[PDB]
Design a protein around this ligand. Structure first.
Ligand code: NA
Ligand code: NA
Ligand code: NA
Ligand code: NA
Lengths: 316, 317, 316, 317
């Protein structure tokens, strides 16, 4: 029996990645799409073999044709609709970042617990074999003691920064199981419309440091390197996976005279995400990203904002 | 309006690649799956959001809930079902290789023309931006004069065909160059136990250049194609299985090798492009789709490779 | 006519890289090696086809069989012997880092000018086609406006940190023609012997930031990436060149859908260094790293030490 | 005590690679250079810190200032000067290819044995850690059973040979496997104007596996060798010119391709390793250096490639 998904809006992330992945997925299916525009919803539904189209989110939430919703709305709309979906008895996969600040996630936790539904922030990377292999290799001692994590995530768009800043943070927290204690950061804003377009960050995790930069006005780039006393792990396509490059990691030894390449081509990380979610709904034991965790992640982002207003370290 | 696909059988190639690509595709959709085992069909249909499941191929063909069929059956069954589908008024995407012998394709051509439906062999690579770029770069003079094409396609399987991979170095070379080979030298080896072909090394003379490659069903997985000319070479990284093998990119190296250009086409979704091209062809009659005439020319090369494998020298195509 | 080199000591950097490069070089040759241990000098001389061996540095400096010296002594001995060589009328190639403090370089400048000899710090990378191509590409607008330079230089040795920290700094200054204004850094010391074994640095160059880390107790790694609005340049083997990997750079465009690879295999950067030095001796016009530039570089390193003792930014 | 080398001629291969490598080498040194043009010899000698320059080969061979010679003359001059050097009591490193025909090597063998000097053809690659690792990995079972070796060696030069590059795919395969080919199919093309050989495509049957490759003096620069087995494959990134071409490394891919190992040997200095091995062989008589007997077996393959190029099918080696 398939977990039945409803899609809130015809947003591009849904159209290009998640909706086709749900149709591909073994244990779920999309039964409905909802948009303020019935015509748009119907058009997307027709394309992807979806039986139902609704002219409002509320009408889909009230329906019994879905068990769960996917929410690829802008961040400013995540809390409202995650809560309404849960209050309608639906399980929720909400796109990252879940919230604008950490405290906002308490109300989503309350909605999860009160309605006894699964609610999770959509960090597809944490279901990828690539990131599971980074985490296991570090845990097995393959790089010795981790001392530095270095990375970057940039792209170019001139018509938000949190939407990419979260990734170096979540991937490091996931791979290590640790939380940073303090942050130094420097953020630059667009001269005209005043939004944040660049940030350089150093996070002290005590035993190691994470350093990275993000930008919405630089040439496309993404990389993460986990560097220890006995080796390093280079993640080639850390965030957008197959949409960026090969789904692989390199493990280099201490001298660099030998490396191992581990390949995970055609991993379909969005499909893995929704399959893990469906298992979690069915059995309650599957590792899915917890809201508690989502909150810890957002605490780091909030500390990065605070650090950007000061000259030195800011406690997380 | 979506072109409506029916799937003949629950074969793995359909389940793993083509069916999800049709659902992802902008101008088509899967409305039915058919299998001798109805339970199997229904299970697949449920998974992929497909409204209809049929307990026989004949029943799906007779239905008006599909406009077209996809046929991922074994080669020995391609001709029979391609023809029956066309005679039922359905357009046909048939998996490669279309036939066992070039001559067998004449009856499929007759079915296409008699029923006025689109019938095509499913060479997904020809709809990939990667292979379109190889073809345009060669045509623009980026490697000077083409002199040699070198490649390989191997995997390991001992659960107990070679044509299913041998066709790819041949089709990709023909597609990229627009030429046909005149003659072939080849050497083929068989499995000691079950007697089937498990290895072939081939050289094909295209007059102005040669193609050399080997294929095997009992070697470590590898795939590569290199188009090498007087002024550069093009290395195709992931020529056949694309994203399932590696990066969807090519390298153009200059004459000296002191400079290369890398062209990337990540997440091209070549199976989706294939069915989208097919749907356009059904709707307008002008879209480049692999013609049966071209399929026949391709099979003529494979047939010549069989003949060459029984001789010590060159065999004319 | 060949510029005749004398080698001060049988140090490993000389034996493994510079001495053979001088013999290979078109416009110079090694005529003498000097060591406190004459036997060692004679053994090295015999190996490399060098006619003279001396039992003291002073004796070689007094001789007319050399026109120039190469000095691969430890940093603490650079000033003394650079000055004595110049006062003996010899031109000087001194290994990096030239000095422990920027102010120490004034006496070397005085020796250069007083004796009218060429004196230069041995930044072999600045004579490499790789780094000349980075510089020209950035100057031509190939990456648009430079916004961030990210890199690393680490190796493992437990039997020092300035010897690698200078490289991210010099290569950035060389490639951009700019100086940093301020520095944030964090440095860690060996629990036992108290020396610096790790440093993470961010340098504000106003229009862009440089971030890097260095360590003498981590797996071998080296990389530099110059990242702008319209592309990025990745330098594959920035510092040790052929001893690390391919001598090449990748120029990626804004979208990453196309890159150019520029290759400079078998560049022999140490040979190119001494050839440039010999041309400078002969004509006075060749670009050679100036002591004034060496001093500017050391000012950055000094600022990194100072920054490591504070919470926030330190002015250079 | 350093083995003292004399260089016969100021040829470019010596100037660019071997002479500086001898000066770098731990157990030898260049003491003399000889050329018909004394001024040229003296200029080179001055550059490389070489104490003696001679105005004829004969005068250097008669001198006691050298123990050994390096001979980077054109192939047509190798036999003459290898023999004269040995007859003058000097050990010989002669550039590849040693001879034009296999039979020509018998007189060099006679000179080696008669004078009790070390004489070897300069296959620097066989002293490289890269090729030693290929050989050991194959021997250890890392790729299972070897089934196909595929490669290429091309460059572009149009002003007034193919053997100078054809020998490399052959020697590297023979070295890595320890086997000899039994028969050859080949096709060779000649320059329309000057009539020399500018392109060959070759397949060599080693019984258990085949070697396929092409070489050309009129194509974009390329070099690669892949040793492909049941269990894996080994890709040699910079097989022949090593650091001059690219990274000195190999990739060992497993059966599925889901894991590879990269072995790196940066700054191997293969020419220095060659002369160091040669000096050890002169001093102790036990060091592996390429034997003239092995050189002859190699040339037998090349001679069979010429013969195969004149016929339609297989030619026995
Ligand atoms: Na599904
Ligand atoms: Na579709
Ligand atoms: Na020299
Ligand atoms: Na030497």
């Amino acid at each position: 029996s398939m977990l039945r998904f409803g899609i809130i809006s015809t947003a591009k992330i849904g159209r290009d990645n998640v909706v086709p992945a749900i149709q591909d997925a073994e244990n779920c299916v999309v039964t409905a799409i909802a948009s303020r525009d019935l015509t748009r919803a119907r058009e997307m539904a027709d394309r992807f073999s979806v039986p139902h189209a609704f002219g409002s989110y509320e009408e889909m939430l009230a329906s019994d044709v879905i068990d769960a919703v996917y929410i690829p709305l802008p961040t400013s709309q995540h809390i409202e609709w995650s809560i309404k979906a849960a209050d309608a008895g639906k399980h929720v996969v909400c796109e990252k970042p879940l919230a604008l600040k950490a405290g906002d996630i308490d109300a989503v936790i309350a909605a999860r617990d009160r309605n006894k539904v699964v609610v999770t922030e959509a960090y597809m990377i944490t279901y990828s074999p690539v990131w599971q292999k980074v985490r296991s290799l570090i845990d097995e001692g393959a790089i010795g003691s981790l001392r530095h994590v270095q990375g970057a995530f940039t792209y170019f768009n001139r018509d938000g920064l949190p939407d990419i800043g979260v990734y170096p943070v979540m991937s490091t927290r996931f791979s290590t199981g640790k939380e940073p204690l303090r942050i130094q950061a420097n953020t630059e804003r667009d001269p005209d419309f005043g939004t944040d377009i660049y940030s350089s960050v150093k996070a002290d995790f005590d035993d190691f440091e994470l350093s990275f930069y993000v930008s919405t006005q630089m040439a496309n780039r993404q990389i993460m390197v986990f560097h220890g006393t006995n080796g390093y792990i280079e993640v080639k396509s850390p965030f957008n996976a197959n949409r960026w490059g090969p789904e692989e990691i390199e493990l280099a030894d201490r001298s660099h005279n030998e490396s191992r390449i581990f390949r995970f081509q055609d991993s379909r990380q969005y499909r893995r995400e929704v399959e893990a979610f469906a298992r979690a709904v069915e059995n309650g034991k599957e590792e899915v990203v917890t809201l508690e965790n989502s909150k810890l992640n957002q605490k780091v982002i909030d500390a990065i904002y605070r650090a950007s207003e000061k000259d030195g370290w800011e406690a997380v």
